């Protein structure tokens, strides 16, 4: 009788998607990147960028 927005109503989202509770609980939307020292940009790429 009345369409309820799952993005506004959390119970409707839990009805359609049972994973929403543990998606919010385990913070899979704030996942961090892989750890370790990132390498530096190659000089060739930099000399190609600032060409004539």
């Amino acid at each position: 009788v009345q369409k309820k927005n799952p993005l506004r109503n959390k119970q409707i989202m839990l009805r359609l998607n049972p994973y929403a509770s543990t998606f919010a609980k385990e913070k899979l939307g704030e996942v961090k990147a892989e750890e370790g020292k990132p390498p530096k940009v190659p000089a060739s790429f930099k000399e190609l960028l600032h060409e004539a």
């Binding site: 190609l48 060409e51 004539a52």
Partner: protein
């Protein structure tokens, strides 16, 4: 050239002989033969008007009419479809039969080695 009754025939209309020439709306068209004479040939050709189609029966003689090369794709397609379906049934493997509409390209890498990019400007001054 010899023409049957019921073959798909396309017309191109040259200016060599002006006898029995059709209008420029029929220039370079395609139709189906229902009538063959000593010289002329009766062809049905479809015609657009507003919202609908009217068939028109027109007479062109031999030097502008020729058998069309639109249908041979149908016969070659049915022949290959039958033959690779026979090979698929013999070998017991699924194979692709339809025509695909050419999906967009996938991902790949291009090497900068031996292919150093050149820098250009709107005008080619040299």
């Amino acid at each position: 050239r010899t023409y049957r009754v019921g073959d798909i025939v396309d017309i191109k209309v040259n200016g060599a002989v002006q006898k029995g020439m059709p209008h420029k709306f029929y220039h370079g068209k395609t139709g189906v033969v229902y009538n063959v004479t000593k010289s002329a040939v009766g062809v049905i050709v479809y015609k657009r008007v507003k919202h609908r189609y009217i068939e028109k029966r027109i007479n062109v003689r031999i030097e502008h009419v020729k058998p069309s090369r639109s249908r041979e794709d149908f016969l070659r397609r049915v022949k290959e479809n039958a033959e690779l379906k026979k090979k698929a049934k013999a070998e017991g493997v699924p194979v692709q039969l339809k025509r695909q509409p050419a999906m967009p390209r996938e991902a790949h890498t291009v090497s900068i080695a031996d292919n150093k990019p050149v820098t250009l400007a709107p005008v080619a001054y040299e």
